[PDB]
Amino acid sequence: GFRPINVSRYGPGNMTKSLRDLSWFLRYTTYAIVAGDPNIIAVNVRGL
Amino acid sequence: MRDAVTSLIKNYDITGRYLDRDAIDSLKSYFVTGTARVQAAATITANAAELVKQAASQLFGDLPELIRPGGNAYTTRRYAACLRDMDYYLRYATYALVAGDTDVLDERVLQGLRETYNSLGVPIGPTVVGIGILKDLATEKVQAAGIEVGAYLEQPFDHLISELSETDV
Amino acid sequence: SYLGGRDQESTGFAWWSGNARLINLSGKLLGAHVAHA
Amino acid sequence: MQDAITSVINSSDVQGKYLDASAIQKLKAYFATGELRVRAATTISANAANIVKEAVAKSLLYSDITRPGGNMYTTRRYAACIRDLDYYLRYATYAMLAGDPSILDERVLNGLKETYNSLGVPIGATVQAIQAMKEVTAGLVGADAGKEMGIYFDYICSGLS
Amino acid sequence: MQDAITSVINSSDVQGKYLDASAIQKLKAYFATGELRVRAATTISANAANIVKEAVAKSLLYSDITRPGGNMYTTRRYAACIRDLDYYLRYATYAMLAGDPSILDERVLNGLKETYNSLGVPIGATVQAIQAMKEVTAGLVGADAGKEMGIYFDYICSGLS
Amino acid sequence: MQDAITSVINSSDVQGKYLDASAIQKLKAYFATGELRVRAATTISANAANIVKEAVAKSLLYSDITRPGGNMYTTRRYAACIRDLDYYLRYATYAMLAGDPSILDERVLNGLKETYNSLGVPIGATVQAIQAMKEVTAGLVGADAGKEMGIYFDYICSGLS
Amino acid sequence: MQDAITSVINSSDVQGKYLDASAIQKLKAYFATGELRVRAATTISANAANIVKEAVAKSLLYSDITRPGGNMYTTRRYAACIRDLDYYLRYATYAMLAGDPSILDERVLNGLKETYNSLGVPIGATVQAIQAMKEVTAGLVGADAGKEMGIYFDYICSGLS
Amino acid sequence: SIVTKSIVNADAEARYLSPGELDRIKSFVTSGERRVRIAETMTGARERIIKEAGNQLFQKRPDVVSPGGNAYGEEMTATCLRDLDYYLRLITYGIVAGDVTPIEEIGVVGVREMYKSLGTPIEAVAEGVRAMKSVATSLLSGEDAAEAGAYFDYLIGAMS
Amino acid sequence: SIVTKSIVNADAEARYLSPGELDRIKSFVTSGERRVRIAETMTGARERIIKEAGNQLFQKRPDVVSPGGNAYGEEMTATCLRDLDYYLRLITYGIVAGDVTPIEEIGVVGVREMYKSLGTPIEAVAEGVRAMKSVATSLLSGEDAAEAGAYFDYLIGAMS
Amino acid sequence: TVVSQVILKADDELRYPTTGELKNISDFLKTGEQRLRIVDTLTENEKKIVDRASAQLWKKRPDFIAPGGNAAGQRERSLCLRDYGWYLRVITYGILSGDKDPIESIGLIGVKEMYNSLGVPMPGMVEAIRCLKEASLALLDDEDAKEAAPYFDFIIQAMS
Amino acid sequence: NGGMSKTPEGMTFATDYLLPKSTANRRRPGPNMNMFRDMARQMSSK
Amino acid sequence: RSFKVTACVPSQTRIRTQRELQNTYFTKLVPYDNWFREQQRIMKMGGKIVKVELATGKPGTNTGL
Numbered sequence A: 001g002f003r004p005i006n007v008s009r010y011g012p013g014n015m016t017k018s019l020r021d022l023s024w025f026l027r028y029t030t031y032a033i034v035a036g037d038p039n040i041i042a043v044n045v046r047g048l
Numbered sequence B: 001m002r003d004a005v006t007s008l009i010k011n012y013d014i015t016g017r018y019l020d021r022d023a024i025d026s027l028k029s030y031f032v033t034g035t036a037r038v039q040a041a042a043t044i045t046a047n048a049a050e051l052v053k054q055a056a057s058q059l060f061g062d063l064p065e066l067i068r069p070g071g072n073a074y075t076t077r078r079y080a081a082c083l084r085d086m087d088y089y090l091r092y093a094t095y096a097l098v099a100g101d102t103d104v105l106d107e108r109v110l111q112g113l114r115e116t117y118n119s120l121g122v123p124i125g126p127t128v129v130g131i132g133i134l135k136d137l138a139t140e141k142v143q144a145a146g147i148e149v150g151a152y153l154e155q156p157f158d159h160l161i162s163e164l165s166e167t168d169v
Numbered sequence C: 001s002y003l004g005g006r007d008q009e010s011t012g013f014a015w016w017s018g019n020a021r022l023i024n025l026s027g028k029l030l031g032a033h034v035a036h037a
Numbered sequence D, E, F, G: 001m002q003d004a005i006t007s008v009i010n011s012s013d014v015q016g017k018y019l020d021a022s023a024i025q026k027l028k029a030y031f032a033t034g035e036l037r038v039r040a041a042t043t044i045s046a047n048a049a050n051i052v053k054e055a056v057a058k059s060l061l062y063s064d065i066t067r068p069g070g071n072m073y074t075t076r077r078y079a080a081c082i083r084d085l086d087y088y089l090r091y092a093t094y095a096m097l098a099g100d101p102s103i104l105d106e107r108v109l110n111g112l113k114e115t116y117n118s119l120g121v122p123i124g125a126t127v128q129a130i131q132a133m134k135e136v137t138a139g140l141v142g143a144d145a146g147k148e149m150g151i152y153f154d155y156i157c158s159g160l161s
Numbered sequence H, I: 001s002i003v004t005k006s007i008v009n010a011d012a013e014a015r016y017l018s019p020g021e022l023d024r025i026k027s028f029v030t031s032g033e034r035r036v037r038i039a040e041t042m043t044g045a046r047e048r049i050i051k052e053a054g055n056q057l058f059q060k061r062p063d064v065v066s067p068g069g070n071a072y073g074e075e076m077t078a079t080c081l082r083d084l085d086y087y088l089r090l091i092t093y094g095i096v097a098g099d100v101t102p103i104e105e106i107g108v109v110g111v112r113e114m115y116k117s118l119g120t121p122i123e124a125v126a127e128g129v130r131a132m133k134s135v136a137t138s139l140l141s142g143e144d145a146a147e148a149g150a151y152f153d154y155l156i157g158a159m160s
Numbered sequence J: 001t002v003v004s005q006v007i008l009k010a011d012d013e014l015r016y017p018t019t020g021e022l023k024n025i026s027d028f029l030k031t032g033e034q035r036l037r038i039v040d041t042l043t044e045n046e047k048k049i050v051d052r053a054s055a056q057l058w059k060k061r062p063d064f065i066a067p068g069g070n071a072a073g074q075r076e077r078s079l080c081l082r083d084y085g086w087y088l089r090v091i092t093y094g095i096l097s098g099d100k101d102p103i104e105s106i107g108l109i110g111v112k113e114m115y116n117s118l119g120v121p122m123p124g125m126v127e128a129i130r131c132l133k134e135a136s137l138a139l140l141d142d143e144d145a146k147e148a149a150p151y152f153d154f155i156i157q158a159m160s
Numbered sequence K: 001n002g003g004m005s006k007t008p009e010g011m012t013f014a015t016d017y018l019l020p021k022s023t024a025n026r027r028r029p030g031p032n033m034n035m036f037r038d039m040a041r042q043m044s045s046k
Numbered sequence L: 001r002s003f004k005v006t007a008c009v010p011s012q013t014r015i016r017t018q019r020e021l022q023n024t025y026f027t028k029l030v031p032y033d034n035w036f037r038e039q040q041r042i043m044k045m046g047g048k049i050v051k052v053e054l055a056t057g058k059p060g061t062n063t064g065l
Ligand code: CLA
Pocket: C015, C016, C017, C018, C019, C020
């Protein structure tokens, strides 16, 4: 039941919050790798 | 905590008097609005878990400094804490709306709130905007339910504004 | 809020009447005619 | 209580950027000097009570502090002054392994000046006491890590004065 | 605590059924007896220190248990007796005002039989105490509510003995 | 706590002799299999909210204990059953690193059975639920650690009965 | 927690009468022997450390108790063995000064028989120890005072066996 | 008040106002015109109740008036009616509150430690408020004597 | 053990074992073959090492050898020679357990109260196990001598 | 109900219930036959409600019936149709009790995370109760629609 | 092999790496000055 | 004097407050002076009380603590 969403139906002000999250999902993954503990991934994702 | 009835008790108890004509007409002025108080308090809690969600998305779409890494609403550790710390301002505004005065707001939420937020780095600034986005709104769901709105249903909200925010002028 | 896509239940149209998802979609209606032309 | 891992990431969190090449250059020295940090930590815990015995024998005994009138005359206060002198060896070794002096800011320098001005403890006798064991540990763990251990003692001694 | 409004609700959802008309015909009787129950809780509490004064003077004053040798003579424990007797009268009032004796099962009759037989407190004097308490309050609130008090005073002493 | 490390210590200590060949023959089989038991605890710690879904839906769901009249019907007791089943997973994995079910004696199976009698949950449904977590863990961790899983849930299966 | 003055008084209060002349002689004989008892207890309190090494040196050392397999093998169990022996001496000097066997029920003999069975400590070396402890404290304080001390040590072993 | 007790239980459970706690406020404010008429009757006849409870106290228990008692004197009688003036005036405060808690935080919490210090028998005041209960139901109509008589009958068991 | 101390802190904060903390176990299961190569050396060389370090101990403290001292005679050496034999068993138990914790459950927590009643000067057996430290480190490699010396230095600070 | 609010209040303050809640108890107990006009018109009209709301849910949000959803199989949809009348049962417990005490302790305490133990997500099941409110309030008469409407309204706030 | 401990100690420090150096730098506003920013961008044509 | 109590307290708030799980069915030794209060606290939370035995009582004494 998944379809890829179009940008024109979505909105440019709506997707500029969206695309920075995709860097932010791995920016905290790079933070947690050098932190040596996955707690910061596993606490900022619950209920997102 | 301290009702509009019980505030008028120790407005009269400390001088040692009975209930005169001014006591019998100011208290009747509270009771004629009591049907309008309670039915407004139902529809405020109609979608109160939605009402904080519509306000803070309208807050953070209005002040986008508080999302991008700046002041503290950055992670969901902050953001879901922000929605809870918003939700106390909605929930205690229901109590003083029923209680008449703002003395429930005076010694449950207001005392120490300048000193809790300063110890965390939480700004007092957009918190005033966060109550300013609710007090005008809260009035939308009172208006769409058909209850009149004005004198009160703000009596509580700007007492959370004029006493929390620091005096400039 | 919307941006459902092309199903039965976002637009109210079924698998037949198989264009009327593109009455209001401006861009994919152009891809209908250019594939048709 | 935030460490060198947290202070680097929170320097890049509020900037919003990734790990930039100056910070990994800081993080490389934090990770490559771990066997210096472990060897320093395992030897101070190897003789924790020898160091504080030689520390008070360096600078505190046979003063006026031990004579009556002084603030180490009863055997209550000699156990107190030697517990508190142990605490500046525990928390120095705690900030040694985390690499940041922010443990001492939260834990030990919160109400230290409030305590010692309420019992009338001589502060000027304490700032030479922790300076005395700065020599003793650096003679015990070596000149490399004693230079490293000497910063957190001097951060305590800066907050003490 | 199960209530008489809620035990008939607790009788239904254990079976998982909706509210039967025989359960409604139970409930419509208990709503209509509302004023008869709430007024007796006022006038019991209006002199609740006075009922326990007259109840102890019925069958415990001047007797051989009040004389030395018996276990209510010292005044250490006779003041712990009438305070223990006062908790029976207050928990009878909650037992009437709820309309179910489930309140007495969960916080009066839990371990009360064993803690009296350990101490050597006479149960036969306590049943003689609390039965004399019932005949004061049935003449105090009227015999229409006195038979309502008689369900719960005799739920205690039948459970205690 | 008594580890399998401390089992062969305390056995050899009360004998007074040393770590001979009969002692260390358990040690060499401990450390060869110790790499595999720490790999099971990694995959458990990522799926810890998921094994409780796959086990309750295997054994407990679509049943009469879920129906009203059953004990696991209301959502308070439905919540406080997944609490009491998450804890049975986590203390089982403490024995996976331990190699000894002594951890289950001290913290889990000390006074649990009398609490379940005084609360009145069915004991055989728990053993039906603990046996549900036998195979879904070994479906994730592999049957080689499933034999290592094969002991401590069966210690719960024998100890609670 | 019942003195021999009070056990005269509590016997005189279940009767509810005044001080009989027969009960006067039951405390004047207490007031006769009291100046022996204060002088006895100070000689125990000086040599309280000299008693406990001697009783251990008569029966406990170089025996089956200090084997590699035994009760008092490790130095935590040896630490408790002098600690559980010190309370037998210390409570007896309360009992000798009170002139009562009462005080060693409320502090010593609550559950001490089954407590030694639950841990795995034999009672047979204990009754060989306190009876050895009775002889060294007999000649230390004099056999007239030790006859008063000797009866309470036999009140220990009656409860412990 | 009722509104004070309804807030402080819904706040202590960290909750909004209940549907079961909103109707009691709806029951409060529609009984608001009724309850304030009751306290106007007690304040409007407040000289009568203090005079005719003193006449039904002192005949009913005359040992506090006869000399060597506590309330003996030409002033000490007149300050005893000062003490009965206060426990009429608080009953007007509890009636407009709904709850009796403006008498709990004012007039009833520390009485047993103060009439012990003053030499007044505490039970003799409990014959007084029971006397002024009988005047106030004779002053009032049929239904409201169940209302205003209960606020007296809280205070009878709370003194003695 | 290394497992047990890492369990009872993660249990006390009511979580699982976090995967930054599992690697103290993941490391030591590879080096468990190292420690059983270490523990076999010290047990076989023990009955060599007991008959000179006690004689090394008696040079710096000879009054315990003297009459009046607590080690006078050959029958009063097995109180002392077996005690250093008792202590090296706890050292080798501390080798195999990984951390220092079997000595805490066996050999440290009453030594102040034990040797006070036994009449032994307690500052000698710290020097006696200081004599144990100097010669046991010579029998192994220096990587083993640094690790096995750290268990010795807790037993130095045990009696000091 | 209102009576278990008062006894569990008055137990820890060790008091009898005062007149501020005894008037509040008696005011609930005169409204049983008013509340019983609402409880049977929910009862025999149950199956008219239970699929008029169930069709209302999937015409609003069809993902629980979509393949890969939650009630895509019939053994889940037979469960999920049952839970509506289970929620219609416990709501009618609340209108009879006039408070929150049955509707708390049966189907509301802990449902926010124990749907997450199952497959069913939270805020779609919030939409299921909100469409069940208008499926019941259209059947209810208008002057007693406003009484039973906050009891449906509490379930929306506590679940979301 | 299977070393009990790890890492090369290295020659020095970790002593004074504590003070970070960066151009924060400054605060071009970027958020709620957008309306103002648009006016300034709009003004540039002149 | 003290009572050897064997009681079991269901916590019955623990899923709201989401705390750690400790285990009840305890066997403790409550002294004499507060058991008209300590038993009441077990009665507030619905705690079943199995056996109450006074450990070292001498029941019915008049003096003697
Ligand atoms: C210029 C021509 C044109 C265009 C662009 C449209 C556009 C549209 N029509 Mg449409 N229509 C037209 C002419 C047109 N109409 C004419 C002339 C007819 C009469 C026959 C129809 C009858 C028609 C129906 C019956 C309805 C529409 C609908 C629609 C809308 C949805 C289309 C859809 O889902 O297709 C659906 C396509 C199919 C179901 C495929 C059917 C294929 C048929 C059966 C093939 C016929 C035989 C063919 C020649 C093959 C022979 C093979 C040989 C080997 C035997 C869309 C706006 C719908 C509407 O109102 O939505 C707004 C609607 O319900 N159309």
